[PDB]
Structure 1
């Protein structure tokens, strides 16, 4: 069931050709589906009326096939433009576009060829073992409100740390991993903790 997008493209094009071939068996109101029956049984003034019913229906049948192949080719081209964009952004790049190259934060993609298609093996970082913490938007020290340069202020219950957002790594809060802006009184939910000066 994995290959279903490529197998359905193979199946749709086979179904379209089999439909086009099977439409040669249709009379369209002629005395026979077989053009050699008409030409072996009827003389030209009578035959040309029957052949024109076959021409009309076979030409309408072939117009129907080509029209649905033009619409299907536009759908394959939209998929090929998407595959060409996935190639550039995720094989030749790393994409910041959420869920463009697999679920999770994109690390890299590898292209593999497949019949009438491409397969991308999207390598993604998925965060996996949550822990809960108390958190603060900012921290009061000498009346100064401190904010983290990178990451978040968190507490294990008794102590306050700064960590990056996507992986728990408790660092001691210092004037190097934080920046000041203004006094405490402006910030909704600021907390009081010492900020160490290295």
Structure 2
């Protein structure tokens, strides 16, 4: 199910999946609105496709130059072959014709060399596009800013004239808040560290929250792991770490 896929890919960026399920409608709406925004961004901004357009122009431009090079004398009496063929005998027309060949050959070699270099550049771009389709569509990539800006969620390919367009769906955290943090907590001399997440405080109590989405949970021995003791960590703060077993083993 696609919902569970999205929970997968939320878990893949450090956000516990419950975040997805409890907000499913909200992510759904943001995704739909984002697609609409892509619609309009294309349908209005002409330059959005510059990178493809440029390619076309370059090739077209080169061809034009090539063709125009047939209108140059290169030192010959005329740029038209049949003109010389119809005006001079072979012993003299040979020299003019030779100048035309030398020039046209030089122009053609220049054209081919520019094409070779441009094709190498395009091959570099296509290898990068294949890499992005492999690690970016067919899977979820942890490489920062390689697929999209923000944490990657998924990516959808689309065709385009002589190129490809990826719609990179990425997760970007939005509304942050300051809290007082602390690397560890002294409960009974021990120093409990976060199992996953950080310790935060809203000014009065201490919570352990996951990395990337403020969801505070009461601090529990299931949230933290003990290591060492108080006197070695720099910045450790006193607090109490609730342990689940005691209320059962008291009632």
TM range (shorter): over 0.9
Instruction: Choose from 191, 196, 207 the match for 1:161.
Output: 207
Q: CA deviation at 1:102?
A: 1.0
List 4+ stretches of structure 1 deviating above 6 A.
none
TM-score under structure 1 length normalisation: 0.99
Normalized per residue, the structure richer in strand is: 1
Q: CA deviation at 1:161?
A: 0.5
Q: How many residues align?
A: 197
User: Secondary structure at 1:182's aligned position in 2?
Assistant: coil
Residue 136 of structure 2 is matched in structure 1 by 90
For the aligned residues, what is the CA RMSD? 0.5
Q: CA deviation at 1:97?
A: 0.3
Q: CA deviation at 1:42?
A: 0.9
Give deviations 1:19-42, integer Å, cap 9, x for gaps.
Answer: 100001111110011111111111
Give deviations 1:93-139, integer Å, cap 9, x for gaps.
Answer: 00000001110000000000000000000000000001100000111
Instruction: Choose from 79, 89, 93 the match for 1:47.
Output: 93
Give deviations 1:124-183, integer Å, cap 9, x for gaps.
Answer: 000000110000011110000010010100000001001111111001111001001111
TM-score under structure 2 length normalisation: 0.78
Matched residues in 2 for 1:139 and 1:152: separation? 11
Q: CA deviation at 1:84?
A: 0.1
Structure 2 unpaired stretches of 5+: 1-46, 244-251
Normalized per residue, the structure richer in helix is: 2
Structure 1 unpaired stretches of 5+: none
User: Secondary structure at 2:227's aligned position in 1?
Assistant: strand
